[PDB]
Design a protein around this ligand. Sequence first.
Ligand SMILES: COC(=O)C[C@H]1CC(=O)N(C)C1
Length: 126
Amino acid sequence: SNPPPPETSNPNKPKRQTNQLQYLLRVVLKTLWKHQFAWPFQQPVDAVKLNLPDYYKIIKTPMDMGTIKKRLENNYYWNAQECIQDFNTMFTNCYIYNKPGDDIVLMAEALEKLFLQKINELPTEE
Ligand SMILES: COC(=O)C[C@H]1CC(=O)N(C)C1
């Protein structure tokens, strides 16, 4: 079976809408989401459908852009660092689970290159 997804709603978690978080949605998430290689990363890994019964034995902090998109659209975060960390967890999980040179790793690398380019120009806080 699959684990429950990461949390995307938590009314008692303090949250903010900031210009950096707006950039993370409007620039970073949108750029990666529309990319031809986004699809494996647009929702939690379905270890049942994909026949990866060891996935959640190895990956204990799952993350995906569907979760990140919901967190941004629901104003789940307090700061940009928390969202940046989610993206990096997603990429790292992919590199940890898979073998070098696998298609999925090349896909992650292409998305990560764009991510790094956009993060390099994260606006200063208002
Ligand atoms: C469509 O799913 C794939 O192509 C590979 C799996 C495993 C992995 O790390 N993912 C992000 C999904």
